[PDB]
Design a protein around this ligand. Structure first.
Ligand SMILES: O=C(O)CCC(=O)C(=O)O
Ligand SMILES: [Mn+2]
Length: 293
């Protein structure tokens, strides 16, 4: 079965350290750049409200066939609200595992996910509300946009440097991700080798795998050896749309891989040229942006 990679670093900054994100990320860099990804838990009382326009949030998620690459050698189109997507997502997971959604071990979803990706016997199909522009229905963080009411208790979050809308981006706006069990993202790095930062507003965890930048060429070499040859000649920007690869394959080839379960209220930071991939444990809502130092 699947062997979980070692855990990436988790930081629990004090209020003093939590004052400036770029200063904190610079200070953790000597460790975090050696693991590619890291997780940051804000202080316990740092709880931003969810600020998307929930009544009008409507989207058509993309369909994901888990074993599509293995099948190299149909489904109807569905529009959802946030509520109706969650009902679908929870019903899917509880039916699949025959138990309540929060009782399914994170290790079991992870093991099953990687089995299904390589299985030709069972064709599991899921849906992912990925790459939703925060311009559509607003960011999940409060913003001094004047469009949505900012309560006094929320102004500190509108002004916080950990609000993804306030990260420096000039060498763009955050994107939103509505997940369900087994929805996923394949191995990639950011445009211009940028950092990325991801906040899980609510829901079940997002499971990540990361590779430090010093091993980027090692990963690309394993891809060269083992990814489907039909896509081998493709430029990286296109290959990255279908670069699905079990972390144990990279590990067997000597590529360092680290993992984490990002829970609600936690940030993940990916360092420049740190390959990463992952999948969602269940119904959740994330926001991410590329930033520059
Ligand atoms: O959560 C996802 O689907 C993608 C996240 C990602 O690639 C990022 O935050 O850099
Ligand atoms: Mn990314």
């Amino acid at each position: 079965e699947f062997v979980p990679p070692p855990e990436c670093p988790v930081f629990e900054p004090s209020w003093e350290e939590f004052t400036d994100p770029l200063s904190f990320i610079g200070r953790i860099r000597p460790l975090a750049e050696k693991t590619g990804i890291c997780k940051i838990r804000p202080p316990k009382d740092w709880q931003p409200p969810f600020a998307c326009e929930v009544k009008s949030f409507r989207f058509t998620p993309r369909v994901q066939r888990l074993n599509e690459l293995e099948a190299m050698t149909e489904q109807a189109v569905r529009e959802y609200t946030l509520q109706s997507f969650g009902e679908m997502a929870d019903n899917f997971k509880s039916d699949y595992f025959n138990m309540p959604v929060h009782m399914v071990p994170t290790e079991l979803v992870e093991k099953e996910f990687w089995r299904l990706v390589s299985s030709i016997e069972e064709d599991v199909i899921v849906e992912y509300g990925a790459d939703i522009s925060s311009k559509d229905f607003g960011s999940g963080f409060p913003v001094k946009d004047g469009r949505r009411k900012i309560l006094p208790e929320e102004e500190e979050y509108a002004l916080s440097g950990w609000n993804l809308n306030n990260m420096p981006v000039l060498e763009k706006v955050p994107w939103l991700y509505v997940g369900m069990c087994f929805s996923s993202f394949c191995w990639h790095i950011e445009d211009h080798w940028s950092y990325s930062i991801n906040y899980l507003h609510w829901g079940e965890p997002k499971t990540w795998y990361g590779v430090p930048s010093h091993a980027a060429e090692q990963l690309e070499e394993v891809m060269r050896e083992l990814a489907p040859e039909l896509f081998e000649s493709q430029p990286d920007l296109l290959h990255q749309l279908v670069t699905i690869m079990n972390p144990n394959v990279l590990m067997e080839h000597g590529v360092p891989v680290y993992r984490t379960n990002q829970c609600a209220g936690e940030f993940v930071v990916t360092f420049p040229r740190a390959y990463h991939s992952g999948f969602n444990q269940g119904y959740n809502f994330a926001e991410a942006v590329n930033f520059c130092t």
